Ligand binder design. Structure first.
Ligand code: MG
Ligand code: MG
Ligand code: MG
Ligand code: MG
Ligand code: MG
Ligand code: MG
Lengths: 138, 199, 190, 175
RNA sequence: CCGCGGCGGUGCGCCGCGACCGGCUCCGGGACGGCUGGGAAGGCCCGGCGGGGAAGGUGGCUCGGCCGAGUGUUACAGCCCC
RNA sequence: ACCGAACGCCGGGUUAAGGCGCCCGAUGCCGACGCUCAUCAGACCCCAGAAAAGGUGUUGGUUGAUAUAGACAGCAGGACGGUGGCCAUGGAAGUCGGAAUCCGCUAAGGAGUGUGUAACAACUCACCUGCCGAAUCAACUAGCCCUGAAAAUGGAUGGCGCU
RNA sequence: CGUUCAUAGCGACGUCGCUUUUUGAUCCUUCGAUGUCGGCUCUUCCUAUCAUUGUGAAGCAGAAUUCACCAAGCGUUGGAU
RNA sequence: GGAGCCUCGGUUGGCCUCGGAUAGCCGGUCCCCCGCGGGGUCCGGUGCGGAGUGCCCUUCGUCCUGGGAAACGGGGCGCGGCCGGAGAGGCGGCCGCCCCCUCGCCCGUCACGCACGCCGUUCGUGGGGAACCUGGCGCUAAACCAUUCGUAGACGACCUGCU
């Protein structure tokens, strides 16, 4: 029933730690709870990193299990994980959470007025749909 | 201003410590559905633990001595009372703040209830271990009303299924209304996603 | 230590239709349906091949006590496929020294009355498990036949009437009496 | 002897020059220790066991930390052990899989304390040797020898339980 | 008496602020020395040399749509590593 | 009586010994690595409880073997002849027991492991083949847990509890 | 020892433990006093179980009797001295 | 509709699926079954959850006039009807009818003791208890002592009888 596997070439998202919020290519598997990790275009150095602080995605790319940073950089740039990650919905809601955190007070006031007017218009439309469904069921 | 905690799947002492601390911090907590509390360690271990607790009783006057409450809500009240400083006035005020229920009453069945993942079985126990339900433990110690509570919970699960069907109908009306209105709220929807909403 | 993977495959024949809702497998075919809920067993159950030719069971990162469960899931799947296709037939003979043990079924095979065990007057009524049919066979003197699909139910129903006819407060090495299981096979051979 | 994260120190030493011998031989060891003070102390311990040399009747010529010549390459390490039980002293051979020699020896100290209650004052490290893909005798190490290794994270139980503690959603674990 | 013009103790009570000092507890930066005059790493790769897991191959089988996936077999380098 | 530390009255800071789920101040670290299932789990000098022995319960280590000359358990043919050999007479053609203790067929039976006899007879174990085809066997040893382990009022890791 | 058979039941030569239901050992509390033995009455508790309930093993053919487990719920008498 | 005493907590609310953890949420249901709904098969979208408690809902200065986008919405503890809710209900939805208003988002237009820097601002609240007062409708006692009884009893207490 599993879909995401720890494979040589698995791209993962670091949850916490020093390189938090960055992408990871798994190069080799060291132990049950420790992996060998490269970050060629995501400003992460080659090091070991446990499986607790990484969230594996559904991206795979092809390079042998002991690549000396160059072939995995070329595989990263060939598969183009940067633009596909920017087009990925989960990174879009991550940067939506980042915009919510960077929301200024004047920006929050504009958002609140837009919430108010949008909810009034959609609530009037929901009431029109309710009376139309009542007339249809009548 | 009142927490409504669900006792389903939550561990006994793991939930009781958090409830004791949050009630000593001046907050009204209502822990509900306490026969769904599961205790780590299997059923014969937990049953012999509570039977040893039943054997501990005052020799001269057992009516004066330890009161052995059989209901799961009062077992949870006892395991919070053993964590609260109940010999003091602030501990008695905490016991007055805490309200514990078997099943879930009509004052609290139509309320959104909370889940503590720091005291939950799937988070805290390994999946290969064993556990025991406090409802089954109480019924085989002598609590009388597992079946009446089961029928009342079946009735309110039917009522909550009807309510969730109505909520799904309101939600499909909300989605089709957003589909109708997304041409005239084009600059109302965009100013939420440039600041971090709906994406 | 934690073994990284233990896998096992079950190749189902073309007379069997199996499917699974999570860890809840259901096996239907000629003789009927049999369900088994492998929740709280904590394995992976994949079902692959065109028209689901094999059932694959995985255990990931399990030590010895959970590596010992892959083959028992495989064995329950073999027994369930055997009960669906060929069924289970347990033959059990009434061994007695002097008193002939009188066995009679009541509804179809559900209630079984046992009489004249060691000359006792107390009749022994046994309810069988739901799905197990009891019968008195032909061309044999005192012998019961238990037919069914679930090996659990059929063998538990055999153990009930085997433990009902026990000798109390005597030397059972001398008093060799009772209804004892003699043969374990299928309904049809194919 | 206590432990932290361990470091490997090449320590050489000799005796003081005497009128009967002006040039004593130099003896080298590879002490696994947290810092150089306790590295020099364990050096005097093992040299006092082996040769006739005490700290006041000798001198350490140089104590320096040696670093891993390839820290980015995962390696197998076979470590020979001489520990002391509640009964008499026993000998062992362990295999681990880590990047550095000092990291493998750290994992060895934690594993000895976990399995056999062997403390850092009772554990005497004989020697550590790096091993290729062959010449391994432990199945827990040999199960990681695969060209295309493949395993999920099956029961990925969540953490961060207490940032906001009271929630509506029951937490998920299938990832 | 109009002057808070200068000095001194000050105010009926509740307070707030500024700057300076002593004792602390933290944060953000900047630049320096030693090392095995640091180890591996990042970039272009060059003319050779040996060994080993096993790959746009070969190839027994299995699963599907000439093509894709898994397993094993000798093993070069056009997958790699020292 | 133990560890730390010795004392005028206070404010700020920092610790020792101990701790940081709640009582109870502080791990509400997205702590690291393993071990442990207890139908009597375990929980910190003094100190308030446990032994010899045993366990394929489970985790490691030490030693010695065999597997394509085609293992281990699993269905299967056999324990003959010199030889009632030899002291034992009260009976040893393997047989209560003890000094003895090899050849032949050889594929193979040790002057024998048991069932059992006044003696027999008979059932039946080294080795290999027909079938499944790669990791297995044996003895020690160290961890945690279990048995050993039984007292009288109801009873105490301090309590709640904890996997 | 048990017709053969160490272990059904026993078990020498040795050795490891529990109890304060016996006597010892000490003098820690009490000598400006804690009424000192038995029997009668009465209640509760322990199991190291004699019998009863449920079982396993016998040198258990049946009857009778020994060994062992869960187990203190209910019983354990009338008398001569 | 009115001050006036005492006791305090507060400082938007969330009006609800069950369920699994080696899975789960949402659709039409072209296909099928059962009593408009539920359930099963196939297919499609996300899944460190955006049909998100890391969440959602209400704005928290006022009024004047004069435009644009949207809207027939709101109110008079609005009057009568239809109901649902019993585990510890004590609230909510839907219709007929009289009148009034331009409230939500942007803009032009000024004015609100602008109390001259200084702290318990705001409110759930017409907060809970007691004493005076504005009216309409509805009402008329019970217990105990004294007597008696004996189904009871130390005294109390208990069972009884008496316009
Ligand atoms: Mg008998
Ligand atoms: Mg000291
Ligand atoms: Mg006196
Ligand atoms: Mg007295
Ligand atoms: Mg006993
Ligand atoms: Mg007498």
């Amino acid at each position: 029933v599993f879909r995401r596997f720890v494979e040589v070439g698995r791209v993962a998202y670091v949850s916490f730690g020093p390189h938090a919020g960055k992408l990871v290519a798994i190069v080799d598997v060291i132990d049950q709870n420790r992996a060998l990790v490269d970050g060629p275009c995501t400003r992460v150095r080659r090091q070991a990193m446990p499986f607790k602080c990484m969230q594996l995605t559904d991206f795979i790319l092809k390079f042998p299990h002991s690549a000396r940073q160059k072939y995995v950089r070329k595989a990263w740039e060939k598969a183009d994980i940067n633009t596909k990650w920017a087009a990925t919905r989960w990174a879009k809601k991550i940067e939506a959470r980042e915009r919510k955190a960077k929301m200024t007070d004047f920006d929050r006031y504009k958002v609140m007025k837009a919430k108010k007017m949008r909810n009034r218009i959609i609530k009037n439309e929901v009431k029109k749909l309710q009376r139309a469904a009542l007339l249809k069921a009548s | 201003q009142v927490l409504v905690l669900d006792g389903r799947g939550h561990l006994l002492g793991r939930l009781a410590a958090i409830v004791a601390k949050q009630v000593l911090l001046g907050r009204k907590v209502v822990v509900v559905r306490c026969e769904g509390i599961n205790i780590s360690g299997n059923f014969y271990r937990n049953k012999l633990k509570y039977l040893a607790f039943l054997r501990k009783r005052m020799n001269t006057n057992p009516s004066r001595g330890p009161y052995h409450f059989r209901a799961p809500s009062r077992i949870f009240w006892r395991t919070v009372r053993g964590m609260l400083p109940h010999k003091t006035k602030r501990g008695q005020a905490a016991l007055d703040r805490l309200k514990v229920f078997d099943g879930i009453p009509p004052p609290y069945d139509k309320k959104k209830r909370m889940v503590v993942p720091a005291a939950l079985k799937v988070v805290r126990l390994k999946p290969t271990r064993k556990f025991a339900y406090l409802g089954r433990l109480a019924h085989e110690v002598g609590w009388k009303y597992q079946a009446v509570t089961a029928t009342l919970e079946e009735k309110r699960k039917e009522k909550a299924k009807i309510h969730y069907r109505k909520k799904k109908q309101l939600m499909r009306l909300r989605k089709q209304a957003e589909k109708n209105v997304e041409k005239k709220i084009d600059r109302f929807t965009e100013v939420l996603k440039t600041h971090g909403f709906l994406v | 230590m934690k073994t990284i993977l233990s896998n096992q495959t079950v190749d189902i024949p073309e007379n069997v239709d199996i499917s699974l809702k999570g860890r809840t497998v259901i096996v239907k075919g000629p003789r009927g349906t049999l369900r088994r809920d492998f929740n709280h067993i904590n394995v992976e159950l994949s079902l692959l091949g065109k028209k689901k030719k094999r059932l694959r069971v995985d255990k990931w990162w399990g030590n010895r006590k959970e590596l010992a469960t892959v083959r028992t899931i495989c064995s329950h799947v073999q027994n369930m496929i055997k009960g669906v296709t060929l069924g289970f037939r347990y033959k059990m003979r009434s061994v007695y020294a002097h008193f002939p043990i009188n066995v009679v079924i009541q509804e179809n095979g559900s209630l079984v009355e046992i009489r004249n065990f060691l000359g006792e007057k107390y009749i022994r009524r046994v309810r069988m498990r739901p799905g197990v049919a009891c019968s008195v066979s032909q061309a044999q003197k005192d012998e019961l036949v238990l037919e069914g699909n679930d090996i659990e139910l059929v063998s538990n129903s055999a153990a009930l009437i085997q433990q009902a006819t026990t000798v109390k407060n005597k030397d059972i090495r001398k008093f060799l009496d009772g209804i004892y299981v003699s043969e374990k096979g299928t309904v049809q051979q194919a | 002897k206590a432990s932290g994260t361990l470091r490997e120190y090449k320590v050489v030493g000799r005796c003081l020059p005497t009128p009967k011998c002006r040039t004593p031989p130099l003896y080298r060891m590879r002490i696994f220790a947290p810092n150089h003070v306790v590295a020099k102390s364990r050096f005097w311990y093992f040299v006092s066991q082996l040769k006739k040399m005490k700290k006041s009747s000798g001198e350490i010529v140089y104590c320096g930390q040696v670093f891993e010549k390839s820290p980015l390459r995962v390696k197998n390490f076979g470590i020979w052990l001489r520990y002391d039980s509640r009964s008499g002293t026993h000998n062992m051979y362990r295999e681990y899989r880590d990047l550095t020699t000092a990291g493998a020896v750290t994992q060895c100290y934690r594993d000895m304390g976990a399995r056999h209650r062997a403390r850092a004052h009772s554990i005497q490290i004989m020697k550590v040797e790096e091993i290729a893909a062959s010449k391994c005798r432990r199945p827990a190490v040999k199960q990681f020898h695969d060209s295309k290794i493949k395993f999920p994270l099956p029961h990925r139980v969540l953490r961060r339980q207490h940032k906001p503690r009271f929630t509506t959603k029951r937490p998920n674990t299938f990832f």
